[PDB]
Design a protein around this ligand. Structure first.
Ligand SMILES: [Mg+2]
Ligand SMILES: [Mg+2]
Ligand SMILES: [Mg+2]
Ligand SMILES: [Mg+2]
Ligand SMILES: [Mg+2]
Ligand SMILES: [Mg+2]
Ligand SMILES: [Mg+2]
Ligand SMILES: [Mg+2]
Ligand SMILES: [Mg+2]
Ligand SMILES: [Mg+2]
Ligand SMILES: [Mg+2]
Ligand SMILES: [Mg+2]
Ligand SMILES: [Mg+2]
Ligand SMILES: [Mg+2]
Ligand SMILES: [Mg+2]
Ligand SMILES: [Mg+2]
Ligand SMILES: [Mg+2]
Ligand SMILES: [Mg+2]
Ligand SMILES: [Mg+2]
Ligand SMILES: [Mg+2]
Ligand SMILES: [Mg+2]
Ligand SMILES: [Mg+2]
Ligand SMILES: [Mg+2]
Ligand SMILES: [Mg+2]
Ligand SMILES: [Mg+2]
Ligand SMILES: [Mg+2]
Ligand SMILES: [Mg+2]
Ligand SMILES: [Mg+2]
Ligand SMILES: [Mg+2]
Ligand SMILES: [Mg+2]
Ligand SMILES: [Mg+2]
Ligand SMILES: [Mg+2]
Ligand SMILES: [Mg+2]
Ligand SMILES: [Mg+2]
Ligand SMILES: [Mg+2]
Ligand SMILES: [Mg+2]
Ligand SMILES: [Mg+2]
Ligand SMILES: [Mg+2]
Ligand SMILES: [Mg+2]
Ligand SMILES: [Mg+2]
Ligand SMILES: [Mg+2]
Ligand SMILES: [Mg+2]
Ligand SMILES: [Mg+2]
Ligand SMILES: [Mg+2]
Ligand SMILES: [Mg+2]
Ligand SMILES: [Mg+2]
Ligand SMILES: [Mg+2]
Ligand SMILES: [Mg+2]
Ligand SMILES: [Mg+2]
Ligand SMILES: [Mg+2]
Ligand SMILES: [Mg+2]
Ligand SMILES: [Mg+2]
Ligand SMILES: [Mg+2]
Ligand SMILES: [Mg+2]
Ligand SMILES: [Mg+2]
Ligand SMILES: [Mg+2]
Ligand SMILES: [Mg+2]
Ligand SMILES: [Mg+2]
Ligand SMILES: [Mg+2]
Ligand SMILES: [Mg+2]
Ligand SMILES: [Mg+2]
Ligand SMILES: [Mg+2]
Ligand SMILES: [Mg+2]
Ligand SMILES: [Mg+2]
Ligand SMILES: [Mg+2]
Ligand SMILES: [Mg+2]
Ligand SMILES: [Mg+2]
Ligand SMILES: [Mg+2]
Ligand SMILES: [Mg+2]
Ligand SMILES: [Mg+2]
Ligand SMILES: [Mg+2]
Ligand SMILES: [Mg+2]
Ligand SMILES: [Mg+2]
Ligand SMILES: [Mg+2]
Ligand SMILES: [Mg+2]
Ligand SMILES: [Mg+2]
Ligand SMILES: [Mg+2]
Ligand SMILES: [Mg+2]
Ligand SMILES: [Mg+2]
Ligand SMILES: [Mg+2]
Ligand SMILES: [Mg+2]
Ligand SMILES: [Mg+2]
Ligand SMILES: [Mg+2]
Ligand SMILES: [Mg+2]
Ligand SMILES: [Mg+2]
Ligand SMILES: [Mg+2]
Ligand SMILES: [Mg+2]
Ligand SMILES: [Mg+2]
Ligand SMILES: [Mg+2]
Ligand SMILES: [Mg+2]
Ligand SMILES: [Mg+2]
Ligand SMILES: [Mg+2]
Ligand SMILES: [Mg+2]
Ligand SMILES: [Mg+2]
Ligand SMILES: [Mg+2]
Ligand SMILES: [Mg+2]
Ligand SMILES: [Mg+2]
Ligand SMILES: [Mg+2]
Ligand SMILES: [Mg+2]
Ligand SMILES: [Mg+2]
Ligand SMILES: [Mg+2]
Ligand SMILES: [Mg+2]
Ligand SMILES: [Mg+2]
Ligand SMILES: [Mg+2]
Ligand SMILES: [Mg+2]
Ligand SMILES: [Mg+2]
Ligand SMILES: [Mg+2]
Ligand SMILES: [Mg+2]
Ligand SMILES: [Mg+2]
Ligand SMILES: [Mg+2]
Ligand SMILES: [Mg+2]
Ligand SMILES: [Mg+2]
Ligand SMILES: [Mg+2]
Ligand SMILES: [Mg+2]
Ligand SMILES: [Mg+2]
Ligand SMILES: [Mg+2]
Ligand SMILES: [Mg+2]
Ligand SMILES: [Mg+2]
Ligand SMILES: [Mg+2]
Ligand SMILES: [Mg+2]
Ligand SMILES: [Mg+2]
Ligand SMILES: [Mg+2]
Ligand SMILES: [Mg+2]
Ligand SMILES: [Mg+2]
Ligand SMILES: [Mg+2]
Ligand SMILES: [Mg+2]
Ligand SMILES: [Mg+2]
Ligand SMILES: [Mg+2]
Ligand SMILES: [Mg+2]
Ligand SMILES: [Mg+2]
Ligand SMILES: [Mg+2]
Ligand SMILES: [Mg+2]
Ligand SMILES: [Mg+2]
Ligand SMILES: [Mg+2]
Ligand SMILES: [Mg+2]
Ligand SMILES: [Mg+2]
Ligand SMILES: [Mg+2]
Ligand SMILES: [Mg+2]
Ligand SMILES: [Mg+2]
Ligand SMILES: [Mg+2]
Ligand SMILES: [Mg+2]
Ligand SMILES: [Mg+2]
Ligand SMILES: [Mg+2]
Ligand SMILES: [Mg+2]
Ligand SMILES: [Mg+2]
Ligand SMILES: [Mg+2]
Ligand SMILES: [Mg+2]
Ligand SMILES: [Mg+2]
Ligand SMILES: [Mg+2]
Ligand SMILES: [Mg+2]
Ligand SMILES: [Mg+2]
Ligand SMILES: [Mg+2]
Ligand SMILES: [Mg+2]
Ligand SMILES: [Mg+2]
Ligand SMILES: [Mg+2]
Ligand SMILES: [Mg+2]
Ligand SMILES: [Mg+2]
Ligand SMILES: [Mg+2]
Ligand SMILES: [Mg+2]
Ligand SMILES: [Mg+2]
Ligand SMILES: [Mg+2]
Ligand SMILES: [Mg+2]
Ligand SMILES: [Mg+2]
Ligand SMILES: [Mg+2]
Ligand SMILES: [Mg+2]
Ligand SMILES: [Mg+2]
Ligand SMILES: [Mg+2]
Ligand SMILES: [Mg+2]
Ligand SMILES: [Mg+2]
Ligand SMILES: [Mg+2]
Ligand SMILES: [Mg+2]
Ligand SMILES: [Mg+2]
Ligand SMILES: [Mg+2]
Ligand SMILES: [Mg+2]
Ligand SMILES: [Mg+2]
Ligand SMILES: [Mg+2]
Ligand SMILES: [Mg+2]
Ligand SMILES: [Mg+2]
Ligand SMILES: [Mg+2]
Ligand SMILES: [Mg+2]
Ligand SMILES: [Mg+2]
Ligand SMILES: [Mg+2]
Ligand SMILES: [Mg+2]
Ligand SMILES: [Mg+2]
Ligand SMILES: [Mg+2]
Ligand SMILES: [Mg+2]
Ligand SMILES: [Mg+2]
Ligand SMILES: [Mg+2]
Ligand SMILES: [Mg+2]
Ligand SMILES: [Mg+2]
Ligand SMILES: [Mg+2]
Ligand SMILES: [Mg+2]
Ligand SMILES: [Mg+2]
Ligand SMILES: [Mg+2]
Ligand SMILES: [Mg+2]
Ligand SMILES: [Mg+2]
Ligand SMILES: [Mg+2]
Ligand SMILES: [Mg+2]
Ligand SMILES: [Mg+2]
Ligand SMILES: [Mg+2]
Ligand SMILES: [Mg+2]
Ligand SMILES: [Mg+2]
Ligand SMILES: [Mg+2]
Ligand SMILES: [Mg+2]
Ligand SMILES: [Mg+2]
Ligand SMILES: [Mg+2]
Ligand SMILES: [Mg+2]
Ligand SMILES: [Mg+2]
Ligand SMILES: [Mg+2]
Ligand SMILES: [Mg+2]
Ligand SMILES: [Mg+2]
Ligand SMILES: [Mg+2]
Ligand SMILES: [Mg+2]
Ligand SMILES: [Mg+2]
Ligand SMILES: [Mg+2]
Ligand SMILES: [Mg+2]
Ligand SMILES: [Mg+2]
Ligand SMILES: [Mg+2]
Ligand SMILES: [Mg+2]
Ligand SMILES: [Mg+2]
Ligand SMILES: [Mg+2]
Ligand SMILES: [Mg+2]
Ligand SMILES: [Mg+2]
Ligand SMILES: [Mg+2]
Ligand SMILES: [Mg+2]
Ligand SMILES: [Mg+2]
Ligand SMILES: [Mg+2]
Ligand SMILES: [Mg+2]
Ligand SMILES: [Mg+2]
Ligand SMILES: [Mg+2]
Ligand SMILES: [Mg+2]
Ligand SMILES: [Mg+2]
Ligand SMILES: [Mg+2]
Ligand SMILES: [Mg+2]
Ligand SMILES: [Mg+2]
Ligand SMILES: [Mg+2]
Ligand SMILES: [Mg+2]
Ligand SMILES: [Mg+2]
Ligand SMILES: [Mg+2]
Ligand SMILES: [Mg+2]
Ligand SMILES: [Mg+2]
Ligand SMILES: [Mg+2]
Ligand SMILES: [Mg+2]
Ligand SMILES: [Mg+2]
Ligand SMILES: [Mg+2]
Ligand SMILES: [Mg+2]
Ligand SMILES: [Mg+2]
Ligand SMILES: [Mg+2]
Ligand SMILES: [Mg+2]
Ligand SMILES: [Mg+2]
Ligand SMILES: [Mg+2]
Ligand SMILES: [Mg+2]
Ligand SMILES: [Mg+2]
Ligand SMILES: [Mg+2]
Ligand SMILES: [Mg+2]
Ligand SMILES: [Mg+2]
Ligand SMILES: [Mg+2]
Ligand SMILES: [Mg+2]
Ligand SMILES: [Mg+2]
Ligand SMILES: [Mg+2]
Ligand SMILES: [Mg+2]
Ligand SMILES: [Mg+2]
Ligand SMILES: [Mg+2]
Ligand SMILES: [Mg+2]
Ligand SMILES: [Mg+2]
Ligand SMILES: [Mg+2]
Ligand SMILES: [Mg+2]
Ligand SMILES: [Mg+2]
Ligand SMILES: [Mg+2]
Ligand SMILES: [Mg+2]
Ligand SMILES: [Mg+2]
Ligand SMILES: [Mg+2]
Ligand SMILES: [Mg+2]
Ligand SMILES: [Mg+2]
Ligand SMILES: [Mg+2]
Ligand SMILES: [Mg+2]
Ligand SMILES: [Mg+2]
Ligand SMILES: [Mg+2]
Ligand SMILES: [Mg+2]
Ligand SMILES: [Mg+2]
Ligand SMILES: [Mg+2]
Ligand SMILES: [Mg+2]
Ligand SMILES: [Mg+2]
Ligand SMILES: [Mg+2]
Ligand SMILES: [Mg+2]
Ligand SMILES: [Mg+2]
Ligand SMILES: [Mg+2]
Ligand SMILES: [Mg+2]
Ligand SMILES: [Mg+2]
Ligand SMILES: [Mg+2]
Ligand SMILES: [Mg+2]
Ligand SMILES: [Mg+2]
Ligand SMILES: [Mg+2]
Ligand SMILES: [Mg+2]
Ligand SMILES: [Mg+2]
Ligand SMILES: [Mg+2]
Ligand SMILES: [Mg+2]
Ligand SMILES: [Mg+2]
Lengths: 122, 138
RNA sequence: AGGAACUCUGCAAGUUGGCCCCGUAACUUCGGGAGAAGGGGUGCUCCCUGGGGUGAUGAGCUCCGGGGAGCCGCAGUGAACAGGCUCUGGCGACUGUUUACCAAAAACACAGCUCUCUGCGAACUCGUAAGAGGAGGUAUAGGGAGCGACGCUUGCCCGG
RNA sequence: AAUGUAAAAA
RNA sequence: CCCGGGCCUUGUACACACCGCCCGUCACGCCAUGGGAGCGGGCUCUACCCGAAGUCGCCGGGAGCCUACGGGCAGGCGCCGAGGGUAGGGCCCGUGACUGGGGCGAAGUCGUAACAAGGUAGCUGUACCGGAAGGUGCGGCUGGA
RNA sequence: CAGCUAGUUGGUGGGGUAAUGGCCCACCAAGGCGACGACGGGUAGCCGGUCUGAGAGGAUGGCCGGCCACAGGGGCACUGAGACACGGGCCCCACUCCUACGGGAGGCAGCAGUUAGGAAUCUUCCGCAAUGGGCGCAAGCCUGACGGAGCGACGCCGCUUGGAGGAAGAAGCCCUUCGGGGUGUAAACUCCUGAACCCGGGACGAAACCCCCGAGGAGGGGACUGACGGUACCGGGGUAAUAGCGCCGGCCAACUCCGUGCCAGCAGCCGCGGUAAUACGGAGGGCGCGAGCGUUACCCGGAUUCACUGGGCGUAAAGGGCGUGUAGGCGGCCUGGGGCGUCCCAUGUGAAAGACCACGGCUCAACCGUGGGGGAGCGUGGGAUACGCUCAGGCUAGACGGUGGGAGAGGGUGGUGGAAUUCCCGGAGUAGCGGUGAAAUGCGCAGAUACCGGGAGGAACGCCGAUGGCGAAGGCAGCCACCUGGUCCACCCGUGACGCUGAGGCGCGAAAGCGUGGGGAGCAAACCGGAUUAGAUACCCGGGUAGUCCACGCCCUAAACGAUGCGCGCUAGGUCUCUGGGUCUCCUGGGGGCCGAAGCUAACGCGUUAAGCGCGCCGCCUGGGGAGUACGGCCGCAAGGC
């Protein structure tokens, strides 16, 4: 455009938008498990994933992934929410956090225990 | 109606050089002169001189060029490689001396209007004056 | 005291009621809906002040009014005349018409749409007839029929 | 003169 | 002409390459969303009724107290007033039987509109019409010959 | 969110105040504000600064400092230099508590501590010794300001877990072509050093107020007080004394083995796993960092992906359907005054802190002190006048105008001609016609088709006709007359910069469609029948209504396409054609085409009819889908449009 057109209308600011209504854009949010379930993956893959629908402190109710092999979540597990989607699963914008509240750590994992809430083996 | 007589002149010179004319004329005007005068003095053009087309004051501008080149396209290197108006009519540019541009790390020139007169970028600093940044040339 | 609990039904009755001021929704064919709704004023005294008619330009008389200060009672359109409001369905566009004496309506009628007959000694109606109406009109007219403001629309079937 | 899904390219 | 093949050229939305691709309906599931008799909530606006404290103005009289008596304080009233109440509008959010379409989903039903004259060139505004893609009419465009 | 406004705008006088003022009141006048964004909604304390960034920019306001605002919610005033007053007062609301029911007490957004909420955020410490504040002549009193210590890898910074030697190389473990290779100088072992711990010493921060002389002053002189703390630091003694995390398919530095088998799982993007995975998981080994390493969240970067610096719009997302034009934007050549913009100089200001430089302080460093420099920006003064502006004066190159001519399906109105179709009347004539891929429906002995004559009627204009002309687009074609728009050429006669563009506005705007009335030949959605097919709501055939035609009105969309906004200047030519001027195989102008200089382009391609080189102005774009959909608003009879 001309300069003058800029002096009028002007440049519209990008204004981006979120990927996670964990509300308050907090780093994590607590919640209780509403339902522990296992769901089929998407277009190119397959393998029933371990997931749970959690009711938030923020009055919400989101679905969240349970990472790692084997878990202990049940229809009343309080748990910590982490946020991070999953290409494989339709609308799942949050990870559960292994090793906090009623969510155990991955049993017997030796590699990268930090990401799977697992204490140091003696 | 012709918007900017200056951009025009500059352009006339650019459009002519590219085809390697000997001299393109231009509608005469006192302020237009200085641009040439300096533009020539610095060595960008063999020179200029008032003329007359069918009763119209104009200015012959004798273009300079480099020597012939060897090899494919013996295109003679230019003497004016670059020329461009800075302050336009739709956007006047004004600079303080404490902030005048250095064209092509000094190889280039930046003619500009000022209270003391039309001066090179260097002559600007010389007499320590700022003004309307007209255009740069290299 | 209660406030529809009555009862087919708020049937009857009560509420509201005039005027001045403020204020007033959806929807709407832009006119309406509206008096929507909801509220305020309303008497008497004293004082200052605007405009009009008569006349003379004024006085008196008379018409409409504006402002200030005060009085009394439970109460000021102090008695009489005097809308209860709102929301939302059905039918019918609408004002009208009707079963004189058990039915006023969703029934008829209506402007408007369509079909059809009729070329003038018209078709159609009354009359055995003469005749008359139609009309001292002439297809943008006249008779018959159905539908019935307005908006959108009104499909297929011609065997009987 | 119709249609042939769904896992193959260091 | 049927089948297989070679060279040139042309079209393509095809490229493990026409046993290619590919469209819309319907059927199933998930998801977000619009409408919807309404229902519930927040913020706000207008008009009115009630109105504390308090300043300010008048009185302080048929009464109180101080009084250097001239006045002062208490008390009386009035205006404003937080806020309450009433009625009526505006914006916004949540919720609702049902309903519209939309996105996604290794497989379903229907047909095959488009991509090659895609076997009626296609595409388009619009109008009618039909299970569905679509078809047809009028014009218009080549992104057709 | 497009209009808002009654103390609303202004005045006169009056109250009130430290004081100006509709701050408040009485009267008067009708005004004030708004696309340069009023009014409305959503959000938010603001700055010094902080963060990122090459910068321009973006984002942000924690701690420190400055200003504003509040003290459970709201209103009020009292005292006073000052308050509408956090730890004062009155009232209403909510909440807490006390009560002998009449009443009464309270406000941690001060320091601590509690609880609730939350992903999460500290000790009910010490001291007035310093500094600072209030009162006091003074002694001194108060000081959860403050100086300090305590808790948390929350951050930055310094440091430790040891230093040298130590095998052709222990065992263990992993790999292997079964020779060997790796962890690896790593270990053990050897000597050395000595965090921790231990004993002795032990601060600076503190001189003044005070008292003596000098006067009680100047000046000299004397003494008291340390919370941190027996801590920092110095001296002596002295033990080998925590290592973790992320990753190793590609981006991306780090490779093998087993297990596993679209499962278990991974995932930031691309993708990886379906028996043999450097991509899952374990192991051996490796890369990266280390009292940390990873994750999640948000900001700036990359992102020249909102482009001022620094982008675009023929086909990729994007030129408005087209014109007239308001506002605004932009503005040819000469001279003069002013000096607004602009440039320069001088000074004021731009606090401190911070940023950068230098040097010093604590063993270094972080942190800290001192000093230095510049800084955008605004205020005052002075100066320059080229460009911009502005007043004034002149010009003719832009634009407009006179006069004379030209081509043209440009628009409107009235009339008019022929050809064919159709129906009807007449004649003559008979056995089929028609239609298709083929055929049927259909028409036809009630005499069709084919042919001649006559009549009615409606629509469209063959050849000329084009690679053609006109128009702003949409579009415009027999002929004739009238009314009228645009444009081109010659003369260089007139005006004297009157120009260009154009948000909104207004006008035009194929076709289809809508209203009322008309008209209706041919054609033809829908509709019916025939045929094709698995089916055929279609293509083909027979029939056939609205419509197509006119008037008046409405609708306003499109592949309204060159898919290319307009105006001007500049940048080789070759050829074809329409139109004008000139004594002319030539030239000069305006138009429509093709091929091409240079150049532009992602390529195709464009190329004096630019998509090249430049300036002005408007419109538009900013991943595909959802969608030109939804809500709202506006317009419309409706369809529906913006
Ligand atoms: Mg799957
Ligand atoms: Mg389990
Ligand atoms: Mg379990
Ligand atoms: Mg275990
Ligand atoms: Mg991993
Ligand atoms: Mg040369
Ligand atoms: Mg020289
Ligand atoms: Mg009651
Ligand atoms: Mg009963
Ligand atoms: Mg009943
Ligand atoms: Mg009564
Ligand atoms: Mg009453
Ligand atoms: Mg009554
Ligand atoms: Mg009554
Ligand atoms: Mg009145
Ligand atoms: Mg209502
Ligand atoms: Mg009314
Ligand atoms: Mg009503
Ligand atoms: Mg009603
Ligand atoms: Mg009224
Ligand atoms: Mg009503
Ligand atoms: Mg009301
Ligand atoms: Mg009323
Ligand atoms: Mg009353
Ligand atoms: Mg009264
Ligand atoms: Mg009385
Ligand atoms: Mg009086
Ligand atoms: Mg009188
Ligand atoms: Mg009289
Ligand atoms: Mg008289
Ligand atoms: Mg008189
Ligand atoms: Mg008088
Ligand atoms: Mg009188
Ligand atoms: Mg009353
Ligand atoms: Mg009364
Ligand atoms: Mg009465
Ligand atoms: Mg009354
Ligand atoms: Mg009455
Ligand atoms: Mg009444
Ligand atoms: Mg009522
Ligand atoms: Mg009703
Ligand atoms: Mg009726
Ligand atoms: Mg009806
Ligand atoms: Mg009546
Ligand atoms: Mg009657
Ligand atoms: Mg009757
Ligand atoms: Mg009667
Ligand atoms: Mg009777
Ligand atoms: Mg009877
Ligand atoms: Mg009645
Ligand atoms: Mg009746
Ligand atoms: Mg009638
Ligand atoms: Mg009707
Ligand atoms: Mg008839
Ligand atoms: Mg009879
Ligand atoms: Mg008879
Ligand atoms: Mg008669
Ligand atoms: Mg008669
Ligand atoms: Mg009739
Ligand atoms: Mg319809
Ligand atoms: Mg019917
Ligand atoms: Mg049917
Ligand atoms: Mg029948
Ligand atoms: Mg029949
Ligand atoms: Mg029959
Ligand atoms: Mg099929
Ligand atoms: Mg299939
Ligand atoms: Mg396939
Ligand atoms: Mg062959
Ligand atoms: Mg061959
Ligand atoms: Mg081929
Ligand atoms: Mg094609
Ligand atoms: Mg190809
Ligand atoms: Mg492909
Ligand atoms: Mg196929
Ligand atoms: Mg394929
Ligand atoms: Mg179901
Ligand atoms: Mg819904
Ligand atoms: Mg809803
Ligand atoms: Mg509400
Ligand atoms: Mg009252
Ligand atoms: Mg009071
Ligand atoms: Mg007052
Ligand atoms: Mg007294
Ligand atoms: Mg006294
Ligand atoms: Mg006394
Ligand atoms: Mg007294
Ligand atoms: Mg006194
Ligand atoms: Mg009192
Ligand atoms: Mg009151
Ligand atoms: Mg009030
Ligand atoms: Mg109130
Ligand atoms: Mg209330
Ligand atoms: Mg009431
Ligand atoms: Mg309300
Ligand atoms: Mg709702
Ligand atoms: Mg739904
Ligand atoms: Mg749809
Ligand atoms: Mg659907
Ligand atoms: Mg649905
Ligand atoms: Mg779809
Ligand atoms: Mg499916
Ligand atoms: Mg099936
Ligand atoms: Mg399907
Ligand atoms: Mg299928
Ligand atoms: Mg097809
Ligand atoms: Mg086909
Ligand atoms: Mg095709
Ligand atoms: Mg079409
Ligand atoms: Mg069907
Ligand atoms: Mg067509
Ligand atoms: Mg066209
Ligand atoms: Mg095409
Ligand atoms: Mg061909
Ligand atoms: Mg008023
Ligand atoms: Mg005054
Ligand atoms: Mg004061
Ligand atoms: Mg005011
Ligand atoms: Mg005043
Ligand atoms: Mg007043
Ligand atoms: Mg605002
Ligand atoms: Mg901010
Ligand atoms: Mg600053
Ligand atoms: Mg800033
Ligand atoms: Mg700044
Ligand atoms: Mg930086
Ligand atoms: Mg910055
Ligand atoms: Mg930025
Ligand atoms: Mg702050
Ligand atoms: Mg913050
Ligand atoms: Mg803070
Ligand atoms: Mg602090
Ligand atoms: Mg803090
Ligand atoms: Mg601060
Ligand atoms: Mg200030
Ligand atoms: Mg407050
Ligand atoms: Mg308060
Ligand atoms: Mg509090
Ligand atoms: Mg309070
Ligand atoms: Mg305050
Ligand atoms: Mg205080
Ligand atoms: Mg207070
Ligand atoms: Mg306190
Ligand atoms: Mg207590
Ligand atoms: Mg007692
Ligand atoms: Mg207490
Ligand atoms: Mg308090
Ligand atoms: Mg408090
Ligand atoms: Mg505290
Ligand atoms: Mg605490
Ligand atoms: Mg807690
Ligand atoms: Mg602390
Ligand atoms: Mg102290
Ligand atoms: Mg003490
Ligand atoms: Mg402190
Ligand atoms: Mg601790
Ligand atoms: Mg941590
Ligand atoms: Mg922490
Ligand atoms: Mg060693
Ligand atoms: Mg070795
Ligand atoms: Mg070995
Ligand atoms: Mg040794
Ligand atoms: Mg030793
Ligand atoms: Mg220790
Ligand atoms: Mg000492
Ligand atoms: Mg000392
Ligand atoms: Mg000391
Ligand atoms: Mg000392
Ligand atoms: Mg002492
Ligand atoms: Mg002495
Ligand atoms: Mg002495
Ligand atoms: Mg002394
Ligand atoms: Mg001394
Ligand atoms: Mg001393
Ligand atoms: Mg001590
Ligand atoms: Mg010590
Ligand atoms: Mg000790
Ligand atoms: Mg000691
Ligand atoms: Mg010691
Ligand atoms: Mg120590
Ligand atoms: Mg020592
Ligand atoms: Mg020591
Ligand atoms: Mg030592
Ligand atoms: Mg050791
Ligand atoms: Mg050792
Ligand atoms: Mg890493
Ligand atoms: Mg890296
Ligand atoms: Mg690598
Ligand atoms: Mg398994
Ligand atoms: Mg196996
Ligand atoms: Mg393997
Ligand atoms: Mg494999
Ligand atoms: Mg990886
Ligand atoms: Mg691995
Ligand atoms: Mg390892
Ligand atoms: Mg460190
Ligand atoms: Mg970014
Ligand atoms: Mg960005
Ligand atoms: Mg950027
Ligand atoms: Mg771009
Ligand atoms: Mg352009
Ligand atoms: Mg887009
Ligand atoms: Mg335009
Ligand atoms: Mg336009
Ligand atoms: Mg377009
Ligand atoms: Mg338009
Ligand atoms: Mg124009
Ligand atoms: Mg203008
Ligand atoms: Mg100028
Ligand atoms: Mg200007
Ligand atoms: Mg000028
Ligand atoms: Mg001048
Ligand atoms: Mg001046
Ligand atoms: Mg200066
Ligand atoms: Mg600054
Ligand atoms: Mg300065
Ligand atoms: Mg300074
Ligand atoms: Mg500073
Ligand atoms: Mg910085
Ligand atoms: Mg120094
Ligand atoms: Mg140092
Ligand atoms: Mg040391
Ligand atoms: Mg400094
Ligand atoms: Mg400094
Ligand atoms: Mg600076
Ligand atoms: Mg400076
Ligand atoms: Mg300035
Ligand atoms: Mg001058
Ligand atoms: Mg003049
Ligand atoms: Mg002039
Ligand atoms: Mg001229
Ligand atoms: Mg003509
Ligand atoms: Mg014509
Ligand atoms: Mg004509
Ligand atoms: Mg006429
Ligand atoms: Mg004829
Ligand atoms: Mg006859
Ligand atoms: Mg015949
Ligand atoms: Mg004949
Ligand atoms: Mg004939
Ligand atoms: Mg004849
Ligand atoms: Mg023509
Ligand atoms: Mg043309
Ligand atoms: Mg004629
Ligand atoms: Mg003409
Ligand atoms: Mg003359
Ligand atoms: Mg002249
Ligand atoms: Mg001018
Ligand atoms: Mg039209
Ligand atoms: Mg039409
Ligand atoms: Mg229709
Ligand atoms: Mg029509
Ligand atoms: Mg109609
Ligand atoms: Mg009619
Ligand atoms: Mg009609
Ligand atoms: Mg017909
Ligand atoms: Mg036909
Ligand atoms: Mg049909
Ligand atoms: Mg058919
Ligand atoms: Mg069959
Ligand atoms: Mg059939
Ligand atoms: Mg047909
Ligand atoms: Mg006609
Ligand atoms: Mg007509
Ligand atoms: Mg007519
Ligand atoms: Mg334009
Ligand atoms: Mg023009
Ligand atoms: Mg000629
Ligand atoms: Mg000549
Ligand atoms: Mg000649
Ligand atoms: Mg001539
Ligand atoms: Mg010749
Ligand atoms: Mg020739
Ligand atoms: Mg020539
Ligand atoms: Mg010519
Ligand atoms: Mg030409
Ligand atoms: Mg030509
Ligand atoms: Mg070309
Ligand atoms: Mg080339
Ligand atoms: Mg040209
Ligand atoms: Mg040219
Ligand atoms: Mg050319
Ligand atoms: Mg051009
Ligand atoms: Mg281009
Ligand atoms: Mg291009
Ligand atoms: Mg997008
Ligand atoms: Mg998107
Ligand atoms: Mg999108
Ligand atoms: Mg779209
Ligand atoms: Mg899109
Ligand atoms: Mg549309
Ligand atoms: Mg729409
Ligand atoms: Mg909306
Ligand atoms: Mg909505
Ligand atoms: Mg809408
Ligand atoms: Mg309407
Ligand atoms: Mg209609
Ligand atoms: Mg449009």
């Amino acid at each position: 455009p001309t300069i003058n057109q800029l002096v009028r209308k002007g440049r519209e600011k990008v204004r981006k938008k979120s990927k996670v209504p964990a509300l308050k854009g907090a780093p994590f949010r607590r919640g209780v498990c509403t339902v522990v379930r296992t769901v089929t993956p998407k277009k190119p893959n397959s393998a029933l994933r371990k997931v749970a629908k959690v009711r938030l402190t923020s009055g919400y109710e989101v679905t969240a992934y349970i990472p790692g092999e084997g878990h202990n979540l049940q229809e009343h597990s309080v748990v910590l929410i982490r946020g991070g989607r999953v290409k494989d699963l339709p609308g799942v914008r949050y990870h559960i956090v292994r090793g906090v509240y009623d969510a155990a750590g991955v049993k017997d994992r030796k590699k990268s225990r930090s990401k799977y809430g697992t204490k140091k083996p003696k | 109606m012709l918007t900017d007589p200056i951009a025009d002149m500059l352009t006339r010179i650019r459009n002519a050089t590219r085809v390697y004319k000997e001299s393109t004329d231009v509608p005469a005007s006192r302020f237009k002169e200085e641009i040439l005068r300096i533009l020539a003095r610095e060595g960008f053009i063999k020179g200029y001189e008032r003329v007359d087309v069918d009763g119209k004051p104009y200015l012959r501008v004798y273009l300079k060029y480099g020597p012939r080149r060897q090899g494919p396209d013996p295109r003679p290197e230019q003497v004016i490689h670059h020329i461009r108006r800075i302050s336009k009519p739709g956007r006047r540019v004004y600079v303080g001396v404490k902030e005048i541009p250095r064209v092509r790390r000094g190889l280039g020139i930046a003619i500009l209007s000022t209270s003391k007169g039309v001066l090179t970028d260097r002559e600007a600093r010389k007499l320590g004056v700022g003004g309307e940044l007209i255009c740069e040339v290299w």
